[PDB]
């Protein structure tokens, strides 16, 4: 599986994930005047005001 | 602007872009013995071995 890993609304970049990994993710939260966005391999558990989208196809976490 | 967002050869689906966006895109790349296609809002620049289409009208990125 390969996933995007760029931040914010940056031009897209991709990374390969560890063998068994089935998900890519996009986390979003707010800070002062805007959103923050984090993208990578996996689907880490979130809490306390973070939202996350997880998907299961290559480069899906746009 | 609205753009298609479906993958692959799926039936077309659409999303609404941010207010200032002017482009839609379709991106294709090779994945072993297959191809993957992504669609959405924006126009990432061409780079090695990706095929990129961009256009400027609603749902133009078939
Ligand atoms: Cl992509
Ligand atoms: Cu793949
Ligand atoms: Cu890419
Ligand atoms: Cu922060
Ligand atoms: Cu992508
Ligand atoms: Cu429109
Ligand atoms: Cu509209
Ligand atoms: Cu507009
Ligand atoms: Cu595909
Ligand atoms: Cu090149
Ligand atoms: Cu072509
Ligand atoms: Cu129309
Ligand atoms: Cu269409
Ligand atoms: Na449509
Ligand atoms: Na179409």
List how many beta strands of chain A DSSP finds: 5
Q: Hetero groups bound?
A: chloride ion, copper (II) ion, sodium ion
Which percent range fits the helix content of chain A?
A: under 10%
What form of chain A results from the Cα inertia axes?
flat
Major sheet strand order of chain A: 4-3-5
Gap from first CA to last CA of chain A: 14 Å
CATH level-two architecture of chain A: Ribbon
Oligomer: homodimer
The figure for the number of domains of chain A is 1
H-E order of chain A = EEEEE
Taking the sheet with the most strands of chain A, its summary is: 3 strands, antiparallel
Number of helices of chain A: 0
The H-level CATH homologous superfamily of chain A, spelled out, is CD59
**Rg calc of chain A:** 12 Å
Structural class of chain A: mainly beta
CATH T-level fold name of chain A: CD59
Biggest interface reads: A-B, 7 and 8 residues
Keywords (chains A, B): Acetylcholine receptor inhibiting toxin, Disulfide bond, Ion channel impairing toxin, Neurotoxin, Pharmaceutical, Postsynaptic neurotoxin, Secreted, Signal, Toxin
Protein name (chains A, B): Cobrotoxin
GO molecular function (chains A, B): acetylcholine receptor inhibitor activity; ion channel regulator activity; toxin activity
Organism (chains A, B): Naja atra
